[PDB]
């Protein structure tokens, strides 16, 4: 696949900094481009990671899979450490659209089986149901990359 880690075997010390109010799931793309979960980070916490140059990472809300940014972008790739200094991966909220943010809150409060009991315009039912999905995000990033 287009989006995958390279098996560089060259160590790179990384520090994951969760500068978001969410429980963050780091997702490593393996050498076949398949997303693999790593231990989550509580809000406002940092952790040292032994990663490798050319490995690919993305970050999600662990419970909802809402998208997060890392150094203000979608994917993070360790480089070789200069002067023994670790590379920082600063994980933050994006600015969600107001619509997406409202959908997040509604999903957090209502079981999926009850979405269609809500007194809202009909088009929004399908929007609630179309929850964030890492595989779809990777397809989207892949097509953006190709363009």
């Amino acid at each position: 696949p287009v989006l995958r880690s390279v098996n560089s075997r060259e160590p790179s010390q990384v520090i994951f900094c969760n500068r978001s109010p969410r429980v963050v799931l780091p997702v490593w793309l393996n050498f076949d481009g398949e997303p693999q979960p790593y231990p989550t980070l509580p809000p406002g916490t940092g952790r040292r990671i032994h990663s490798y140059r050319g490995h690919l990472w993305l970050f999600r809300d662990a419970g909802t899979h809402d998208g997060l940014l890392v150094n203000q972008t979608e994917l993070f790739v360790p480089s070789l450490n200069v002067d023994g200094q670790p590379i920082f991966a600063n994980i933050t909220l994006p600015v969600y659209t107001l619509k997406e943010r409202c959908l997040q809150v509604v999903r957090s409060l209502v079981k999926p089986e009850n979405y269609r009991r809500l007194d809202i315009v009909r088009s929004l039912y399908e929007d609630l149901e179309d929850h964030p999905n890492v595989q779809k995000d990777l397809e989207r990033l892949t097509q953006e990359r190709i363009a």
Partner: peptide, 16 residues
């Protein structure tokens, strides 16, 4: 041959 990421046994630390 294939080397995956791993997390050393260390404490997490607080930000801000």
């Amino acid at each position: 041959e294939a080397l995956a990421x791993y997390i050393p046994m260390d404490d997490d630390f607080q930000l801000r």
